[PDB]
Amino acid sequence: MLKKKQLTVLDLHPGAGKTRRVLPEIVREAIKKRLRTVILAPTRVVAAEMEEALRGLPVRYMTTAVNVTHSGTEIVDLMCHATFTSRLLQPIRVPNYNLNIMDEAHFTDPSSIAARGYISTRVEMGEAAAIFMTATPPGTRDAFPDSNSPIMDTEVEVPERAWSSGFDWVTDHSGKTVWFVPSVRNGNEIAACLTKAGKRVIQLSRKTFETEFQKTKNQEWDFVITTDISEMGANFKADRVIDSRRCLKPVILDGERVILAGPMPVTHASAAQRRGRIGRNPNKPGDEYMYGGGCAETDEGHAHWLEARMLLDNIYLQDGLIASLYRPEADKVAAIEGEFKLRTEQRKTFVELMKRGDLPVWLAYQVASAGITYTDRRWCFDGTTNNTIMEDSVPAEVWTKYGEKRVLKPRWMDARVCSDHAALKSFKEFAAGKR
Numbered sequence: 001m002l003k004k005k006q007l008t009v010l011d012l013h014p015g016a017g018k019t020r021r022v023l024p025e026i027v028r029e030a031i032k033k034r035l036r037t038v039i040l041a042p043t044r045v046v047a048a049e050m051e052e053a054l055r056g057l058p059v060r061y062m063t064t065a066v067n068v069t070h071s072g073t074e075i076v077d078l079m080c081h082a083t084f085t086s087r088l089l090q091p092i093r094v095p096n097y098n099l100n101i102m103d104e105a106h107f108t109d110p111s112s113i114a115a116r117g118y119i120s121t122r123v124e125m126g127e128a129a130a131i132f133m134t135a136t137p138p139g140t141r142d143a144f145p146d147s148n149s150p151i152m153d154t155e156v157e158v159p160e161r162a163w164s165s166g167f168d169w170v171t172d173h174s175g176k177t178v179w180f181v182p183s184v185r186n187g188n189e190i191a192a193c194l195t196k197a198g199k200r201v202i203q204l205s206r207k208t209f210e211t212e213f214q215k216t217k218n219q220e221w222d223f224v225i226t227t228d229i230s231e232m233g234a235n236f237k238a239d240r241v242i243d244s245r246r247c248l249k250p251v252i253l254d255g256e257r258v259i260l261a262g263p264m265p266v267t268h269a270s271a272a273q274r275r276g277r278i279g280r281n282p283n284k285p286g287d288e289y290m291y292g293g294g295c296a297e298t299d300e301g302h303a304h305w306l307e308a309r310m311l312l313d314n315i316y317l318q319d320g321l322i323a324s325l326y327r328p329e330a331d332k333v334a335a336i337e338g339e340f341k342l343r344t345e346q347r348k349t350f351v352e353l354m355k356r357g358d359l360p361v362w363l364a365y366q367v368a369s370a371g372i373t374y375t376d377r378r379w380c381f382d383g384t385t386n387n388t389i390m391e392d393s394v395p396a397e398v399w400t401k402y403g404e405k406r407v408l409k410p411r412w413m414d415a416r417v418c419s420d421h422a423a424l425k426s427f428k429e430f431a432a433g434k435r
Protein backbone atom coordinates (compact mmCIF):
# COMPACT_ATOMS: atom_id res chain seq x y z
CA MET A 1 0.00 0.00 0.00
CA LEU A 2 2.77 2.43 1.02
CA LYS A 3 5.09 1.88 -2.03
CA LYS A 4 5.57 4.72 -4.59
CA LYS A 5 3.33 4.86 -7.75
CA GLN A 6 0.43 3.24 -5.80
CA LEU A 7 -3.03 4.73 -5.16
CA THR A 8 -5.20 2.53 -3.00
CA VAL A 9 -8.93 3.06 -2.46
CA LEU A 10 -9.79 1.76 1.05
CA ASP A 11 -13.50 1.18 0.42
CA LEU A 12 -14.71 -0.75 3.49
CA HIS A 13 -18.47 -0.13 4.24
CA PRO A 14 -19.50 2.87 6.46
CA GLY A 15 -18.63 2.14 10.10
CA ALA A 16 -16.17 -0.68 9.21
CA GLY A 17 -13.34 0.97 11.20
CA LYS A 18 -11.35 2.83 8.51
CA THR A 19 -10.59 5.82 10.80
CA ARG A 20 -10.30 4.30 14.31
CA ARG A 21 -8.74 0.94 13.38
CA VAL A 22 -7.06 1.03 9.93
CA LEU A 23 -5.69 4.64 9.97
CA PRO A 24 -3.51 4.13 13.18
CA GLU A 25 -2.02 0.88 11.71
CA ILE A 26 -1.17 2.72 8.42
CA VAL A 27 0.44 5.61 10.41
CA ARG A 28 2.66 3.30 12.56
CA GLU A 29 3.85 1.52 9.37
CA ALA A 30 4.54 4.90 7.66
CA ILE A 31 6.61 6.12 10.67
CA LYS A 32 8.53 2.73 10.68
CA LYS A 33 9.43 3.30 6.97
CA ARG A 34 10.38 7.01 7.43
CA LEU A 35 7.65 8.12 4.99
CA ARG A 36 6.92 11.90 5.23
CA THR A 37 3.11 11.64 5.49
CA VAL A 38 0.03 13.90 5.27
CA ILE A 39 -3.41 12.92 6.68
CA LEU A 40 -6.32 15.03 5.30
CA ALA A 41 -9.53 15.51 7.40
CA PRO A 42 -12.70 16.91 5.68
CA THR A 43 -13.67 19.05 8.74
CA ARG A 44 -12.25 20.32 12.04
CA VAL A 45 -14.70 17.93 13.80
CA VAL A 46 -13.13 14.91 12.00
CA ALA A 47 -9.63 16.30 12.78
CA ALA A 48 -10.46 16.23 16.55
CA GLU A 49 -11.80 12.63 16.25
CA MET A 50 -8.55 11.65 14.48
CA GLU A 51 -6.42 13.03 17.32
CA GLU A 52 -8.35 10.69 19.68
CA ALA A 53 -7.77 7.63 17.40
CA LEU A 54 -4.06 8.55 16.91
CA ARG A 55 -3.30 9.61 20.54
CA GLY A 56 0.27 8.62 21.53
CA LEU A 57 1.52 8.59 17.91
CA PRO A 58 3.84 11.42 16.84
CA VAL A 59 1.50 13.48 14.61
CA ARG A 60 1.78 17.24 13.92
CA TYR A 61 -1.71 18.77 14.02
CA MET A 62 -1.82 21.74 11.62
CA THR A 63 -5.26 22.92 12.89
CA THR A 64 -6.45 24.98 15.93
CA ALA A 65 -9.24 22.33 16.42
CA VAL A 66 -6.68 20.30 18.51
CA ASN A 67 -4.70 21.76 21.48
CA VAL A 68 -1.44 19.76 21.46
CA THR A 69 2.16 20.62 22.37
CA HIS A 70 4.20 19.30 19.38
CA SER A 71 7.66 17.76 19.96
CA GLY A 72 9.06 19.07 16.65
CA THR A 73 10.16 15.55 15.56
CA GLU A 74 6.91 14.46 13.84
CA ILE A 75 7.18 13.32 10.18
CA VAL A 76 3.33 12.87 9.92
CA ASP A 77 1.23 16.07 9.44
CA LEU A 78 -2.58 16.27 9.80
CA MET A 79 -4.63 19.11 8.31
CA CYS A 80 -8.05 19.69 6.66
CA HIS A 81 -8.58 19.04 2.88
CA ALA A 82 -9.09 22.88 2.40
CA THR A 83 -5.90 23.78 4.28
CA PHE A 84 -3.84 21.40 2.05
CA THR A 85 -5.23 23.02 -1.17
CA SER A 86 -4.91 26.56 0.29
CA ARG A 87 -1.23 26.01 1.24
CA LEU A 88 -0.54 24.65 -2.27
CA LEU A 89 -1.97 27.88 -3.80
CA GLN A 90 -0.16 30.26 -1.38
CA PRO A 91 3.67 30.93 -1.75
CA ILE A 92 4.39 28.68 1.30
CA ARG A 93 6.40 25.55 0.44
CA VAL A 94 4.41 22.39 1.08
CA PRO A 95 6.62 19.28 1.58
CA ASN A 96 6.47 16.69 -1.21
CA TYR A 97 4.81 14.00 0.99
CA ASN A 98 5.85 10.40 0.23
CA LEU A 99 2.43 9.13 1.49
CA ASN A 100 -0.87 11.05 1.09
CA ILE A 101 -3.89 9.80 3.07
CA MET A 102 -7.29 11.37 2.48
CA ASP A 103 -10.11 10.46 4.89
CA GLU A 104 -13.80 10.90 3.77
CA ALA A 105 -12.36 10.98 0.25
CA HIS A 106 -15.84 11.27 -1.35
CA PHE A 107 -16.08 15.02 -0.31
CA THR A 108 -17.15 17.00 -3.42
CA ASP A 109 -16.21 20.56 -2.28
CA PRO A 110 -13.89 22.19 -4.89
CA SER A 111 -10.83 22.15 -2.56
CA SER A 112 -11.24 18.36 -1.90
CA ILE A 113 -11.59 17.57 -5.65
CA ALA A 114 -8.45 19.72 -6.35
CA ALA A 115 -6.53 17.91 -3.51
CA ARG A 116 -7.43 14.47 -5.08
CA GLY A 117 -6.34 15.72 -8.52
CA TYR A 118 -2.98 16.98 -7.30
CA ILE A 119 -2.25 13.86 -5.17
CA SER A 120 -3.33 11.37 -7.89
CA THR A 121 -1.17 13.25 -10.46
CA ARG A 122 1.89 12.92 -8.16
CA VAL A 123 1.15 9.15 -7.86
CA GLU A 124 0.74 8.81 -11.69
CA MET A 125 4.14 10.58 -12.05
CA GLY A 126 5.72 7.88 -9.82
CA GLU A 127 6.62 10.40 -7.09
CA ALA A 128 4.34 9.36 -4.22
CA ALA A 129 1.83 6.83 -2.73
CA ALA A 130 -1.77 7.67 -1.75
CA ILE A 131 -4.64 6.11 0.17
CA PHE A 132 -8.22 7.42 -0.40
CA MET A 133 -10.48 6.27 2.45
CA THR A 134 -14.20 6.15 1.56
CA ALA A 135 -17.04 3.64 1.38
CA THR A 136 -18.32 5.56 -1.71
CA PRO A 137 -15.63 6.24 -4.34
CA PRO A 138 -16.50 8.38 -7.40
CA GLY A 139 -19.02 6.71 -9.72
CA THR A 140 -20.38 4.26 -7.11
CA ARG A 141 -23.85 3.03 -8.14
CA ASP A 142 -24.89 1.34 -4.85
CA ALA A 143 -26.96 3.54 -2.51
CA PHE A 144 -27.52 0.60 -0.07
CA PRO A 145 -24.10 -0.74 1.02
CA ASP A 146 -23.35 -3.10 3.93
CA SER A 147 -23.61 -1.83 7.52
CA ASN A 148 -22.66 -3.00 11.08
CA SER A 149 -26.29 -3.96 11.78
CA PRO A 150 -29.41 -4.46 9.60
CA ILE A 151 -31.27 -1.31 8.49
CA MET A 152 -35.03 -1.07 7.61
CA ASP A 153 -35.05 0.76 4.22
CA THR A 154 -38.42 2.36 3.33
CA GLU A 155 -39.33 4.49 0.31
CA VAL A 156 -41.81 7.12 1.55
CA GLU A 157 -43.01 10.68 0.70
CA VAL A 158 -40.88 13.04 2.88
CA PRO A 159 -42.07 16.60 3.74
CA GLU A 160 -40.03 19.45 2.27
CA ARG A 161 -42.28 22.20 3.82
CA ALA A 162 -44.22 22.70 7.10
CA TRP A 163 -47.17 20.26 7.37
CA SER A 164 -50.37 19.96 9.41
CA SER A 165 -51.38 16.37 8.58
CA GLY A 166 -50.43 13.28 6.52
CA PHE A 167 -46.99 12.53 8.03
CA ASP A 168 -47.78 11.19 11.54
CA TRP A 169 -44.83 8.68 11.24
CA VAL A 170 -42.37 11.60 11.41
CA THR A 171 -43.46 12.88 14.86
CA ASP A 172 -44.80 9.60 16.34
CA HIS A 173 -41.17 8.34 16.73
CA SER A 174 -39.55 8.31 20.18
CA GLY A 175 -35.85 7.99 19.23
CA LYS A 176 -33.36 10.37 17.62
CA THR A 177 -33.57 11.29 13.90
CA VAL A 178 -31.00 12.80 11.50
CA TRP A 179 -32.90 14.54 8.63
CA PHE A 180 -31.05 15.54 5.42
CA VAL A 181 -32.58 18.55 3.67
CA PRO A 182 -31.59 20.23 0.36
CA SER A 183 -30.77 23.68 1.75
CA VAL A 184 -30.40 25.82 4.90
CA ARG A 185 -33.67 27.67 4.05
CA ASN A 186 -35.57 24.36 3.66
CA GLY A 187 -34.15 23.10 6.99
CA ASN A 188 -35.30 26.36 8.70
CA GLU A 189 -38.98 25.69 7.73
CA ILE A 190 -38.92 22.01 8.76
CA ALA A 191 -37.14 22.86 12.04
CA ALA A 192 -39.75 25.55 12.89
CA CYS A 193 -42.57 23.05 12.19
CA LEU A 194 -40.91 20.39 14.45
CA THR A 195 -40.20 22.95 17.22
CA LYS A 196 -43.89 24.04 17.17
CA ALA A 197 -44.80 20.31 17.63
CA GLY A 198 -42.71 20.06 20.85
CA LYS A 199 -39.50 18.63 19.35
CA ARG A 200 -35.89 19.67 20.24
CA VAL A 201 -34.07 20.46 17.02
CA ILE A 202 -30.42 21.18 16.21
CA GLN A 203 -29.58 22.57 12.73
CA LEU A 204 -26.25 21.95 10.96
CA SER A 205 -24.75 23.49 7.84
CA ARG A 206 -21.22 24.30 6.50
CA LYS A 207 -20.89 27.71 8.24
CA THR A 208 -22.17 26.61 11.67
CA PHE A 209 -20.90 22.97 11.67
CA GLU A 210 -18.21 22.87 14.48
CA THR A 211 -20.22 25.01 16.90
CA GLU A 212 -23.60 23.34 16.39
CA PHE A 213 -22.20 19.78 16.13
CA GLN A 214 -21.01 20.09 19.79
CA LYS A 215 -24.73 20.46 20.79
CA THR A 216 -25.42 16.91 19.56
CA LYS A 217 -23.11 15.71 22.39
CA ASN A 218 -23.77 18.42 25.09
CA GLN A 219 -27.60 18.26 25.10
CA GLU A 220 -30.62 15.98 24.58
CA TRP A 221 -32.19 16.35 21.13
CA ASP A 222 -34.96 14.70 19.08
CA PHE A 223 -34.00 15.84 15.53
CA VAL A 224 -30.85 17.04 13.77
CA ILE A 225 -31.75 18.97 10.54
CA THR A 226 -28.72 18.97 8.28
CA THR A 227 -27.50 19.83 4.81
CA ASP A 228 -25.19 17.40 2.84
CA ILE A 229 -22.19 18.42 5.08
CA SER A 230 -23.13 15.60 7.52
CA GLU A 231 -22.19 13.03 4.78
CA MET A 232 -18.49 13.75 5.72
CA GLY A 233 -17.93 11.47 8.72
CA ALA A 234 -20.25 13.22 11.19
CA ASN A 235 -21.38 10.59 13.73
CA PHE A 236 -24.61 10.64 15.70
CA LYS A 237 -26.15 8.40 18.39
CA ALA A 238 -29.37 8.06 16.40
CA ASP A 239 -31.80 5.30 15.30
CA ARG A 240 -33.35 6.90 12.18
CA VAL A 241 -32.33 8.86 9.12
CA ILE A 242 -35.00 10.76 7.14
CA ASP A 243 -33.55 11.57 3.70
CA SER A 244 -35.26 14.01 1.28
CA ARG A 245 -32.81 12.42 -1.33
CA ARG A 246 -32.43 16.03 -2.72
CA CYS A 247 -29.69 18.65 -2.99
CA LEU A 248 -28.89 21.98 -4.69
CA LYS A 249 -26.62 21.95 -7.72
CA PRO A 250 -24.50 25.06 -8.56
CA VAL A 251 -24.61 25.49 -12.36
CA ILE A 252 -22.65 28.01 -14.48
CA LEU A 253 -25.02 29.40 -17.22
CA ASP A 254 -23.45 30.71 -20.47
CA GLY A 255 -20.10 31.10 -18.64
CA GLU A 256 -21.42 34.37 -17.04
CA ARG A 257 -23.50 33.56 -13.91
CA VAL A 258 -23.99 30.79 -11.33
CA ILE A 259 -27.45 29.65 -10.20
CA LEU A 260 -28.39 27.10 -7.50
CA ALA A 261 -30.50 24.68 -9.60
CA GLY A 262 -32.95 22.24 -8.08
CA PRO A 263 -33.61 20.81 -5.53
CA MET A 264 -32.75 17.71 -7.51
CA PRO A 265 -31.73 14.06 -6.80
CA VAL A 266 -28.60 13.31 -4.82
CA THR A 267 -25.87 10.94 -6.24
CA HIS A 268 -25.75 7.24 -5.12
CA ALA A 269 -22.60 8.11 -3.08
CA SER A 270 -24.46 10.90 -1.17
CA ALA A 271 -27.50 8.62 -0.52
CA ALA A 272 -25.25 5.82 0.76
CA GLN A 273 -23.41 8.30 3.09
CA ARG A 274 -26.72 9.78 4.43
CA ARG A 275 -28.07 6.29 5.12
CA GLY A 276 -24.59 5.34 6.53
CA ARG A 277 -25.21 7.61 9.56
CA ILE A 278 -27.30 4.72 11.07
CA GLY A 279 -26.95 0.90 11.27
CA ARG A 280 -23.47 1.58 12.84
CA ASN A 281 -24.03 -0.32 16.16
CA PRO A 282 -23.94 -4.14 15.88
CA ASN A 283 -25.91 -4.34 19.17
CA LYS A 284 -28.82 -2.20 17.85
CA PRO A 285 -30.35 -3.69 14.71
CA GLY A 286 -33.37 -2.21 12.97
CA ASP A 287 -32.29 1.43 12.66
CA GLU A 288 -34.60 3.04 10.01
CA TYR A 289 -33.83 4.81 6.73
CA MET A 290 -36.81 6.65 5.16
CA TYR A 291 -36.03 8.01 1.70
CA GLY A 292 -38.16 10.35 -0.43
CA GLY A 293 -36.83 10.13 -3.98
CA GLY A 294 -34.42 8.37 -6.32
CA CYS A 295 -30.68 8.93 -7.08
CA ALA A 296 -29.16 10.44 -10.22
CA GLU A 297 -25.70 11.47 -11.40
CA THR A 298 -26.19 15.16 -10.57
CA ASP A 299 -22.40 15.73 -10.23
CA GLU A 300 -22.22 15.85 -14.09
CA GLY A 301 -21.95 19.55 -15.07
CA HIS A 302 -21.95 20.60 -11.38
CA ALA A 303 -19.83 23.85 -10.88
CA HIS A 304 -17.56 22.32 -8.16
CA TRP A 305 -15.63 20.26 -10.77
CA LEU A 306 -15.07 23.35 -13.00
CA GLU A 307 -14.00 25.30 -9.78
CA ALA A 308 -11.55 22.43 -8.93
CA ARG A 309 -9.97 22.96 -12.40
CA MET A 310 -9.63 26.74 -11.70
CA LEU A 311 -7.77 25.87 -8.45
CA LEU A 312 -5.48 23.16 -10.06
CA ASP A 313 -4.55 25.45 -12.99
CA ASN A 314 -3.06 27.87 -10.41
CA ILE A 315 -1.02 25.33 -8.39
CA TYR A 316 2.63 24.79 -9.42
CA LEU A 317 3.46 21.11 -10.07
CA GLN A 318 6.65 21.13 -12.23
CA ASP A 319 7.57 23.76 -14.93
CA GLY A 320 4.40 24.41 -17.06
CA LEU A 321 2.75 21.05 -16.14
CA ILE A 322 -0.70 21.09 -14.57
CA ALA A 323 -2.38 18.47 -12.37
CA SER A 324 -5.33 16.57 -13.86
CA LEU A 325 -8.49 15.64 -11.91
CA TYR A 326 -8.52 12.14 -10.32
CA ARG A 327 -9.47 9.86 -13.27
CA PRO A 328 -12.90 8.44 -11.99
CA GLU A 329 -14.24 12.02 -11.56
CA ALA A 330 -12.53 13.69 -14.57
CA ASP A 331 -15.50 13.55 -17.01
CA LYS A 332 -17.79 15.57 -14.71
CA VAL A 333 -16.52 18.80 -16.35
CA ALA A 334 -15.74 19.71 -19.96
CA ALA A 335 -12.53 21.64 -19.33
CA ILE A 336 -9.13 22.04 -20.92
CA GLU A 337 -6.20 21.80 -18.44
CA GLY A 338 -4.56 25.24 -18.16
CA GLU A 339 -7.46 27.40 -19.49
CA PHE A 340 -7.79 29.09 -16.04
CA LYS A 341 -4.04 29.67 -15.43
CA LEU A 342 -3.52 33.24 -14.22
CA ARG A 343 -0.42 35.47 -14.28
CA THR A 344 1.38 36.18 -10.93
CA GLU A 345 -0.57 39.31 -9.79
CA GLN A 346 -4.02 38.12 -10.92
CA ARG A 347 -3.32 34.73 -9.21
CA LYS A 348 -2.51 36.46 -5.91
CA THR A 349 -5.79 38.46 -6.20
CA PHE A 350 -7.68 35.17 -6.94
CA VAL A 351 -6.20 33.51 -3.83
CA GLU A 352 -6.92 36.56 -1.60
CA LEU A 353 -10.58 36.83 -2.82
CA MET A 354 -11.06 33.20 -1.67
CA LYS A 355 -8.93 33.23 1.52
CA ARG A 356 -9.83 36.68 2.93
CA GLY A 357 -12.83 37.61 0.75
CA ASP A 358 -14.53 34.21 1.36
CA LEU A 359 -15.96 34.33 -2.16
CA PRO A 360 -16.91 31.17 -4.14
CA VAL A 361 -14.06 29.96 -6.45
CA TRP A 362 -15.96 30.87 -9.64
CA LEU A 363 -16.76 34.44 -8.53
CA ALA A 364 -13.15 35.02 -7.24
CA TYR A 365 -11.89 33.90 -10.69
CA GLN A 366 -14.19 36.30 -12.63
CA VAL A 367 -12.96 39.25 -10.51
CA ALA A 368 -9.19 38.40 -10.61
CA SER A 369 -9.25 37.55 -14.37
CA ALA A 370 -10.88 40.95 -15.10
CA GLY A 371 -7.71 42.66 -13.71
CA ILE A 372 -9.55 44.02 -10.63
CA THR A 373 -7.45 44.33 -7.37
CA TYR A 374 -8.62 42.74 -4.10
CA THR A 375 -9.84 45.99 -2.38
CA ASP A 376 -11.63 47.42 -5.45
CA ARG A 377 -15.36 46.74 -4.84
CA ARG A 378 -16.86 48.86 -7.68
CA TRP A 379 -17.91 45.62 -9.45
CA CYS A 380 -20.35 44.84 -6.52
CA PHE A 381 -22.56 47.80 -7.74
CA ASP A 382 -22.20 48.13 -11.55
CA GLY A 383 -23.99 45.05 -12.88
CA THR A 384 -27.27 45.02 -14.87
CA THR A 385 -30.73 45.45 -13.20
CA ASN A 386 -31.33 41.67 -13.45
CA ASN A 387 -28.28 41.13 -11.12
CA THR A 388 -29.96 43.07 -8.26
CA ILE A 389 -29.70 41.01 -5.05
CA MET A 390 -32.97 40.91 -3.12
CA GLU A 391 -33.46 40.79 0.65
CA ASP A 392 -37.02 40.44 2.11
CA SER A 393 -38.44 40.98 -1.47
CA VAL A 394 -36.77 44.46 -1.69
CA PRO A 395 -33.30 45.25 -3.26
CA ALA A 396 -30.47 44.72 -0.72
CA GLU A 397 -28.59 47.94 0.15
CA VAL A 398 -25.18 48.78 1.69
CA TRP A 399 -23.09 51.85 2.46
CA THR A 400 -20.03 51.72 0.18
CA LYS A 401 -16.51 52.37 1.61
CA TYR A 402 -17.05 55.92 0.16
CA GLY A 403 -20.10 56.54 2.42
CA GLU A 404 -22.74 56.27 -0.36
CA LYS A 405 -25.91 54.10 0.01
CA ARG A 406 -26.09 51.80 -3.05
CA VAL A 407 -28.16 48.84 -4.26
CA LEU A 408 -26.16 45.56 -4.36
CA LYS A 409 -25.96 44.69 -8.10
CA PRO A 410 -22.80 42.65 -8.78
CA ARG A 411 -21.23 42.60 -12.27
CA TRP A 412 -21.06 38.73 -11.94
CA MET A 413 -23.94 37.07 -10.14
CA ASP A 414 -23.18 33.95 -8.13
CA ALA A 415 -26.28 32.61 -6.23
CA ARG A 416 -24.10 31.29 -3.45
CA VAL A 417 -23.36 34.80 -2.08
CA CYS A 418 -27.06 35.14 -1.09
CA SER A 419 -28.29 31.46 -0.68
CA ASP A 420 -29.33 32.24 2.96
CA HIS A 421 -29.38 35.23 5.39
CA ALA A 422 -25.86 34.43 6.74
CA ALA A 423 -24.28 34.38 3.23
CA LEU A 424 -25.97 37.65 2.10
CA LYS A 425 -24.85 39.34 5.38
CA SER A 426 -21.22 38.27 4.68
CA PHE A 427 -21.45 39.49 1.02
CA LYS A 428 -22.84 42.90 2.13
CA GLU A 429 -19.82 43.25 4.47
CA PHE A 430 -17.50 42.46 1.53
CA ALA A 431 -19.29 44.90 -0.85
CA ALA A 432 -18.86 47.66 1.84
CA GLY A 433 -15.06 47.06 2.08
CA LYS A 434 -15.24 45.59 5.62
CA ARG A 435 -12.74 42.79 4.84
Ligand SMILES: O=C(CC(F)(F)F)N1CCNCC1
Binds near residue numbers: 416
Ligand atom coordinates in the same frame (compact mmCIF):
# COMPACT_ATOMS: atom_id res chain seq x y z
O1 LIG B 1 -21.15 33.30 3.26
C1 LIG B 1 -20.39 33.29 2.29
C2 LIG B 1 -19.51 34.48 1.98
C3 LIG B 1 -20.02 35.37 0.87
F1 LIG B 1 -19.66 34.93 -0.35
F2 LIG B 1 -21.36 35.45 0.86
F3 LIG B 1 -19.54 36.62 0.96
N1 LIG B 1 -20.22 32.17 1.57
C4 LIG B 1 -19.54 30.98 2.09
C5 LIG B 1 -18.32 30.68 1.24
N2 LIG B 1 -18.69 30.53 -0.17
C6 LIG B 1 -19.37 31.73 -0.66
C7 LIG B 1 -20.61 32.03 0.16
